[PDB]
Amino acid sequence: SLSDLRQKRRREECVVLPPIMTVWRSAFSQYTKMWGLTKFAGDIEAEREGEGPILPPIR
Amino acid sequence: MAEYLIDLTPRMAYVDRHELLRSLLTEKEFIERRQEQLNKSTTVYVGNLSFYTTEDQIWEHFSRCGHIRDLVMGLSEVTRTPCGFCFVVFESQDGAMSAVIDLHGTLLDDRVITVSWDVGCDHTRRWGRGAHGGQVVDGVRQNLDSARGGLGVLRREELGVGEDQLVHYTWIPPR
Amino acid sequence: TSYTPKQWLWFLYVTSWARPFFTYWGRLSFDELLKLSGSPIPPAMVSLWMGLCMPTDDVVQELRIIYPFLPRVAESTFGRALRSLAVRQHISSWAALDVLVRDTLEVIQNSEEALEGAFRSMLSAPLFDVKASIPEGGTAQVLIRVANAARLFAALSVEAFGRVKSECAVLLLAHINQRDAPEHVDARAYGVVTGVVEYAMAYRYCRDDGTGRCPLTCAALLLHRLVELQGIVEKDVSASRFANMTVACIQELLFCVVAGDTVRWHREHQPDGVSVCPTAARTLTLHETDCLLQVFIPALLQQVGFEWPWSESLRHAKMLDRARTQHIVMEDGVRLDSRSVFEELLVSVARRTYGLRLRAILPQSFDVIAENIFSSRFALPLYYRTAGEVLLEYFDRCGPSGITAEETERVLRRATDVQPMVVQLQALVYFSAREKERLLQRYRCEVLLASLVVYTQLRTVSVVQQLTRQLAPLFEQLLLPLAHERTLSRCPVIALVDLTPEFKMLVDEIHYEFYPLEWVPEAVDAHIRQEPPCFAQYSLFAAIAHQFGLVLEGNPRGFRGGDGSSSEVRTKAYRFFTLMLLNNLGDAVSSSGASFHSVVSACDVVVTMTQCLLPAHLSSHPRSMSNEWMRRVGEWTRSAYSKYTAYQQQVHPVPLISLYNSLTFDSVPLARETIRAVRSRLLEKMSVVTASPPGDVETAGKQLLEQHLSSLTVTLTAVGLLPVPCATQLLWASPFFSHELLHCGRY
RNA sequence: GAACUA
Numbered sequence: 006s007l008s009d010l011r012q013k014r015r016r017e018e019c020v021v022l023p024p025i026m027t028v029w030r031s032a033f034s035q036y037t038k039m040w041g042l043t044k045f046a047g048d049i050e051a052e053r054e055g056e057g058p059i060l061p062p063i064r
Numbered sequence: 065m066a067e068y069l070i071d072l073t074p075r076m077a078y079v080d081r082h083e084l085l086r087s088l089l090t091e092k093e094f095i096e097r098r099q100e101q102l103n104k105s106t107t108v109y110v111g112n113l114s115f116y117t118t119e120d121q122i123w124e125h126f127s128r129c130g131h132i133r134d135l136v137m138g139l140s141e142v143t144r145t146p147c148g149f150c151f152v153v154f155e156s157q158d159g160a161m162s163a164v165i166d167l168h169g170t171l172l173d174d175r176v177i178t179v180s181w182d183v184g185c186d187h188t189r190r191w192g193r194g195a196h197g198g199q200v201v202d203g204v205r206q207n208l209d210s211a212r213g214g215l216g217v218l219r220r221e222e223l224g225v226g227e228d229q230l231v232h233y234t235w236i237p238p239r
Numbered sequence: 240t241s242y243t244p245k246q247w248l249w250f251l252y253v254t255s256w257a258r259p260f261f262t263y264w265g266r267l268s269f270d271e272l273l274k275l276s277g278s279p280i281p282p283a284m285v286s287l288w289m290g291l292c293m294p295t296d297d298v299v300q301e302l303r304i305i306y307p308f309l310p311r312v313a314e315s316t317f318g319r320a321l322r323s324l325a326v327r328q329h330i331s332s333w334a335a336l337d338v339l340v341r342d343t344l345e346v347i348q349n350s351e352e353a354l355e356g357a358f359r360s361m362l363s364a365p366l367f368d369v370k371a372s373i374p375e376g377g378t379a380q381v382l383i384r385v386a387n388a389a390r391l392f393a394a395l396s397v398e399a400f401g402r403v404k405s406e407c408a409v410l411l412l413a414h415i416n417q418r419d420a421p422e423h424v425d426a427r428a429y430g431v432v433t434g435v436v437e438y439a440m441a442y443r444y445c446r447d448d449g450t451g452r453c454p455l456t457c458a459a460l461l462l463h464r465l466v467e468l469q470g471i472v473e474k475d476v477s478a479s480r481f482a483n484m485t486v487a488c489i490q491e492l493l494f495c496v497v498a499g500d501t502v503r504w505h506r507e508h509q510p511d512g513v514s515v516c517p518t519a520a521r522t523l524t525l526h527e528t529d530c531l532l533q534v535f536i537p538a539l540l541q542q543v544g545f546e547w548p549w550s551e552s553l554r555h556a557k558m559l560d561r562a563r564t565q566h567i568v569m570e571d572g573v574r575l576d577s578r579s580v581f582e583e584l585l586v587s588v589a590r591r592t593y594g595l596r597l598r599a600i601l602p603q604s605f606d607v608i609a610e611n612i613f614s615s616r617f618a619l620p621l622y623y624r625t626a627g628e629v630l631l632e633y634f635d636r637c638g639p640s641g642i643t644a645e646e647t648e649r650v651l652r653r654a655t656d657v658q659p660m661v662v663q664l665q666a667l668v669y670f671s672a673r674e675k676e677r678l679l680q681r682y683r684c685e686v687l688l689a690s691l692v693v694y695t696q697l698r699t700v701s702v703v704q705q706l707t708r709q710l711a712p713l714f715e716q717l718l719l720p721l722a723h724e725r726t727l728s729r730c731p732v733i734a735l736v737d738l739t740p741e742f743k744m745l746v747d748e749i750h751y752e753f754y755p756l757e758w759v760p761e762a763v764d765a766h767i768r769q770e771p772p773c774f775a776q777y778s779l780f781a782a783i784a785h786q787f788g789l790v791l792e793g794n795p796r797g798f799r800g801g802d803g804s805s806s807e808v809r810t811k812a813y814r815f816f817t818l819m820l821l822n823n824l825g826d827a828v829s830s831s832g833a834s835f836h837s838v839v840s841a842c843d844v845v846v847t848m849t850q851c852l853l854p855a856h857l858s859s860h861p862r863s864m865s866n867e868w869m870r871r872v873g874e875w876t877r878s879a880y881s882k883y884t885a886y887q888q889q890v891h892p893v894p895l896i897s898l899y900n901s902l903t904f905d906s907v908p909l910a911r912e913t914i915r916a917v918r919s920r921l922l923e924k925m926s927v928v929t930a931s932p933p934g935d936v937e938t939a940g941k942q943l944l945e946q947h948l949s950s951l952t953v954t955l956t957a958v959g960l961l962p963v964p965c966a967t968q969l970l971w972a973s974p975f976f977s978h979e980l981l982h983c984g985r986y
Numbered sequence: 987g988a989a990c991u992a
Contacts, residue, residue, distance in 0.1 A: 006208075009223075009224075009225065011214070011225040011226070014210050015595075016116050016229065016593065016595065016596075017593070017595040017596050017599050019114075019116075019210035019211045020174045020175075020211070020544075020596070022174065022544050023171070023176060025466070025467055025470060025478075026543070026544060026546075028466060028470050028478045028479055028482055029466070029482050029543045029544075029546065030546065031479045031482075032479050032480075032482030032483045032485075032486055033486065033546065033547065033548050035479060035483050036483050036486045036487055036490070036548060037548050037551050039510040040487070040505065040508050040509070040510065040516075041508040042508075042548060042551035042552075042554075042555060043551060043554065044550035044551055044554065044602070045550050045553070045554050045602070045604040047603065047604060048550040048602040048603055048604050051602070051603060055603060056602065057549075057599060057600050057601065057602055058599055059546065059599075059600060060174070060544060060599075065253040065309050065312075065398075065399040065400055065401075065402070066253070066288075066399070066400040066401075066402065066403035066406040066407070067310055067402055067403060068249060068250075068253055069250070069253060069254065069286070069287070069288035069406075070286065070287075070288070070403055070406060072403065078987070078988090080987065081989065082987095107831070109987060111987085119699055119700055119701055120590075120698070120699070120700060120818075121591055121592075123700045123818075124590060124591055125456075125541075125591070128452070128453040128456035128534075128538070129451075129452050129453070129456070129457075130450075130451045130452060131451050131822075131920065131923060131924075132700070133826070133827045133830070133831070133832050134701075134704070134830045134831050135700045135701050135704070136701065137701070138987075147987090149987060151987075153830075153831050155827060155832045155833075155923075155924070155927050156450070156451060156923065156926070156927050156930075158310070158311055158450055158452075159450070159451055159452070161402075162311075162402070162450070162451075162452045165402065165403055165404050165405075166404055166452075166456070166457055166460055170460065170541075170542065171541060171542060171544070173592075174544060174596070180987085182987070184831060185831055185987090186831075188987095189987045190987085191987095192987080193987080193989095194989090199987075199988090200987090200988060200989060201988055203989095203992070204988065204989085204991080204992055205988095206992090216992090218992060219992090231699075234638070235638045235639040235640060235702055236640065237640045
């Protein structure tokens with residue numbers, strides 16, 4: 006990157022998750038997709054960007 | 065059982081360069097140190113902790129595997145604030161044995177901890193001894209680990225980029 | 240290398256029960272055994288013990304040739320017999336699983352079936368299986384056999400290789416990743432997950448090993464290591480499928496807790512005719528619900544970043560709520576509302592994370608729960624205010640490094656010898672010389688503990704432990720006269736039921752504040768009779784908890800709910816009962832143990848939770864105060880007796896949800912966790928003391944710990960947990976917790 | 987307690 010734009014990062018924005026999180030997020034998506042589970046009508050409408058902001062996985 | 069098929073004897077690939085300077089040993093520390101390590105070593109080193117990570121979070125994950133006689137969080141000598149290295153002392157050596165196997169590689173605070181064996185915790189090594197009172201690892205690191213402050217003190221110092229939410233341990237006498 | 244026949248037998252004892260589960264080829268090591276089973280693990284995770292060929296010449300020596308126990312596991316009778324019969328059948332070999340388990344069961348009795356029964360025998364002091372293997376599909380009984388073998392293998396592997404997480408994970412991976420058939424892998428994975436979970440819960444229920452290691456956290460870490468090793472093996476059958484199974488099982492248990500019956504949710508909503516859907520065979524017990532919502536799921540979520548199908552799980556659970564009970568077949572069967580379940584899960588999770596982290600992942604449908612789980616400080620009570628503001632000034636002036644017991648004694652005896660209720664107390668219908676000192680020193684001890692709690696705020700374990708050890712001689716010195724003795728000479732309640740003139744004089748003139756447990760139960764008893772006990776004996780932490788307003792209560796709805804206490808009070812009570820009482824129970828006298836200070840006793844912890852669980856109406860000061868107190872307790876006794884009579888008349892095998900409930904222990908999970916942790920800590924400390932070299936201080940410590948265990952049993956019976964209604968049956972009637980403690984087999 | 991190597 007080599008970017009000089011550096012400011013305060015709070016604490017919940019400086020969490021980078023291990024590479025294994027791709028497995029577990031795929032597992033959550035698979036368990037929700039099959040077995041017929043749907044989110045709340047109202048969490049689905051966080052398509053206007055208010056939904057959970059989930060931490061980045063490394064690599 | 066598997067503790068009879070794998071040699072889980074306490075070991076330290078690490079050598080405190082300051083306890084080797086003393087005793088004047090040419091890497092002879094292992095010959096003498098191993099004793100206090102195999103028997104009576106209940107101290108486990110904690111590594112890769114965010115300056116944000118707090119002792120209660122450390123206490124809970126360790127408490128699961130054993131009761132903690134002493135919980136110590138490393139303090140930068142200059143700031144008396146966490147260096148991201150922690151020392152945990154257990155009443156039971158088996159609890160220390162439990163901690164190294166169970167907690168190695170676990171996320172104590174959304175980060176990969178590295179639990180090791182230590183011969184014992186005195187009140188000297190509890191202070192980071194690198195450049196800016198932190199750990200030597202911090203100066204020589206060439207990466208962006210924001211939870212450890214950002215770039216290493218030596219790469220940050222020259223490039224030119226640089227707290228309050230950190231816990232100031234003012235109940236610990238200054239070194 | 241050149242193992243002796245003694246060394247060979249032990250190697251065989253640990254690693255010969257596992258060979259039947261792979262398809263004893265005999266005369267082959269575990270690596271070539273796996274090579275003939277499709278090589279489930281790569282040549283990177285193979286261990287050294289897996290490469291040790293079986294012996295020659297020695298084999299006729301070993302045939303001629305009880306078995307030593309293990310370092311840190313309470314082994315089962317079935318496991319000891321199966322691992323001993325496998326050495327007998329490994330050397331005689333120098334199909335196989337069925338004969339091994341059949342012989343092991345026959346050994347136990349003489350001083351599908353044959354594998355389900357083997358699992359039950361292992362997980363018993365019999366165990367009711369939590370998850371059923373019958374729901375697999377149709378026209379395939381092979382899958383049921385594979386799943387049952389996997390469950391047994393997981394139980395035995397946790398029993399033997401449990402203390403080495405990587406070895407157990409590798410063995411379980413080797414079992415699961417056999418190349419028998421594509422549909423067999425799913426059954427093995429489901430069996431392994433079920434076995435690990437059930438074995439952890441059963442171990443924490445009915446197994447004492449004296450090590451202080453939580454089986455549930457180890458189970459969670461083992462499952463996450465299994466997924467990680469699957470991913471590494473996947474890098475070149477998918478870790479995604481294993482994690483999917485792990486989640487599906489956890490969600491099935493969660494929905495069984497919420498629904499209250501075997502809803503068979505995963506069988507109904509199902510993808511296709513070829514899959515394994517986890518299905519609970521019975522409702523969950525209170526202990527299992529506590530395990531899941533307090534230790535297991537929080538640990539698993541911590542590893543997975545507290546991420547989860549939160550919205551989907553919450554939406555489905557609330558739909559499970561609407562049902563009226565379809566059936567209540569199981570006596571020890573608990574049903575909880577969705578809000579209560581997720582509140583408990585998130586308050587257990589919130590201890591290991593920060594509000595922002597949870598709120599970031601939690602969707603907007605959790606806003607009500609999050610706000611209910613997220614006056615949070617310890618403030619000096621008015622009773623200890625002016626005599627504690629001097630001690631706090633001293634503590635701030637020096638700090639935990641500089642605080643000394645000798646100086647604290649003088650600072651405390653100066654700030655608590657000039658104020659009213661102290662200069663008005665040495666003035667004295669007539670108090671004996673022993674009576675007045677047993678009051679003054681009680682007040683000094685209470686002031687010191689309140690000052691310590693306010694100063695430290697119980698936010699850092701290190702400072703709390705330092706100051707408790709440092710001021711531990713002073714606490715023991717001040718508590719020596721009080722100790723276990725009623726502070727007043729005689730019971731404060733005399734039967735119209737009124738109070739002794741001494742108690743009324745103190746409370747209404749000298750303004751001495753007793754905590755509402757030395758006189759409230761014994762007044763409820765008098766009111767019941769109208770139509771010394773352990774809790775009456777002094778406990779310093781009971782008084783301190785009363786003065787800080789640590790009132791823990793159940794919900795208006797019932798067991799269905801749970802914690803009805805405020806979030807601030809719940810957090811303060813957790814910090815208190817975990818970092819001041821339990822952590823100080825048998826803590827080392829010095830830092831850097833086998834040597835401990837008697838500042839906190841087991842009876843102290845139990846009495847403090849009984850005090851915190853009293854009705855808030857009776858644990859609140861009026862606005863003569865003594866008379867209002869008593870009226871209030873009389874009216875409460877009348878109401879509670881009416882409720883008890885109604886419940887008894889309505890009840891005529893009886894389910895625990897139909898019994899009378901005080902909503903004290905079954906509603907607050909902190910109570911149950913603390914009471915269990917008291918005995919677990921006592922046993923672990925006793926193990927550490929025994930392991931130390933014999934002497935005199937060790938013998939004294941052992942005697943003290945045995946007396947602590949006996950006193951813990953006595954105090955539990957004194958509060959109605961271990962059995963016209965009594966006062967204890969009206970204040971602390973907890974059928975679920977009493978059932979667990981009676982059938983746990985530890986009392 | 988990454989002192990090689992900064």
